[PDB]
Structure 1
Amino acid sequence: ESADLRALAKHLYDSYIKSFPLTKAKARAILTGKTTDKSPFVIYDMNSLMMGEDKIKFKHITPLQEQSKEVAIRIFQGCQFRSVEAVQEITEYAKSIPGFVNLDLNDQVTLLKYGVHEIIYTMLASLMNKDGVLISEGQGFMTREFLKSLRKPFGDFMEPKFEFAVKFNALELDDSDLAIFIAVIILSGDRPGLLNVKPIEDIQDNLLQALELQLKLNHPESSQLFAKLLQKMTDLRQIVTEHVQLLQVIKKTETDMSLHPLLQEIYKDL
Structure 2
Amino acid sequence: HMLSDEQMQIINSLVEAHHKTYDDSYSDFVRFRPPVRRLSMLPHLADLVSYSIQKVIGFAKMIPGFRDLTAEDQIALLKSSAIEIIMLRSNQSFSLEDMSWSCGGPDFKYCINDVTKAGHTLELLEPLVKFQVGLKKLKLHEEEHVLLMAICLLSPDRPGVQDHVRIEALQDRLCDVLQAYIRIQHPGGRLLYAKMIQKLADLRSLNEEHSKQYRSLSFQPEHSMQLTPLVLEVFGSEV
Considering the TM-score relative to the shorter chain, is it more than 0.5? yes
| Counterpart among 43, 52, 56 of residue 86 in structure 1 | 52
Q: How much is the aligned-residue C-alpha RMSD, in angstroms?
A: 2.8
- What is the match of residue 231 of structure 1? 198
Offset at residue 185 of structure 1 (A): 1.0
- What is the match of residue 20 of structure 1? 22
**CA distance in structure 2 between the aligned counterparts of 1:134 and 1:208, rounded to whole angstroms:** 28
- What is the match of residue 189 of structure 1? 156
Offset at residue 144 of structure 1 (A): 2.9
- CA deviations on 1:189-233 (whole Å, 9 max, x unpaired) are 121122212222221111111111122233221222111101110
**8 A Cα contact 1:132 1:143, kept in partner:** no
Is 1:122 aligned to 2:88, yes or no?
Answer: yes
**Normalising by the residue count of structure 2, what TM-score does the alignment of the two structures yield?**
0.83
Q: What letter matches 1:11 in structure 2?
A: S
**CA distance in structure 2 between the aligned counterparts of 1:210 and 1:244, rounded to whole angstroms:** 31
| Counterpart among 5, 24, 41 of residue 75 in structure 1 | 41
| Counterpart among 7, 10, 17 of residue 8 in structure 1 | 10
Offset at residue 143 of structure 1 (A): 5.6
Relative to structure 1, is the Cα distance of residues 71 and 161 closer, same or farther in structure 2, using a 3 angstrom cutoff? same
Aligned length: 229
Offset at residue 251 of structure 1 (A): 4.0
Is 1:161 aligned to 2:163, yes or no?
Answer: no
Is 1:96 aligned to 2:98, yes or no?
Answer: no
- What is the match of residue 41 of structure 1? none
Q: What letter matches 1:76 in structure 2?
A: L
Relative to structure 1, is the Cα distance of residues 153 and 120 closer, same or farther in structure 2, using a 3 angstrom cutoff? closer
Aligned positions of 1:190-229 closer than 5 A: 190-229=157-196
Relative to structure 1, is the Cα distance of residues 60 and 74 closer, same or farther in structure 2, using a 3 angstrom cutoff? farther
**8 A Cα contact 1:128 1:162, kept in partner:** no
Aligned positions of 1:39-58 closer than 5 A: 57=30
Relative to structure 1, is the Cα distance of residues 262 and 212 closer, same or farther in structure 2, using a 3 angstrom cutoff? same
Partner secondary structure for residue 220 of structure 1: coil
**CA distance in structure 1 between the aligned counterparts of 2:188 and 2:72, rounded to whole angstroms:** 41
**CA distance in structure 1 between the aligned counterparts of 2:224 and 2:30, rounded to whole angstroms:** 22
**CA distance in structure 1 between the aligned counterparts of 2:110 and 2:117, rounded to whole angstroms:** 15
Q: What letter matches 1:3 in structure 2?
A: S
Offset at residue 247 of structure 1 (A): 2.0
Specify the structure having the higher radius of gyration (Cα).
Answer: 1
**Normalising by the residue count of structure 1, what TM-score does the alignment of the two structures yield?**
0.74
Identity score, percent? 25
Offset at residue 120 of structure 1 (A): 0.6
Relative to structure 1, is the Cα distance of residues 249 and 199 closer, same or farther in structure 2, using a 3 angstrom cutoff? closer
Q: What letter matches 2:13 in structure 1?
A: H
Offset at residue 10 of structure 1 (A): 1.9
Q: What letter matches 1:264 in structure 2?
A: L
**CA distance in structure 1 between the aligned counterparts of 2:206 and 2:130, rounded to whole angstroms:** 10
Deviates more, 1:158-167 or 1:79-88: 158-167
Is 1:261 aligned to 2:234, yes or no?
Answer: no
- CA deviations on 1:18-55 (whole Å, 9 max, x unpaired) are 12123xxx79xxxxxxxxxxxxxxxxxxxxxxxxxxxx
**8 A Cα contact 2:3 2:181, kept in partner:** no
Offset at residue 118 of structure 1 (A): 0.8
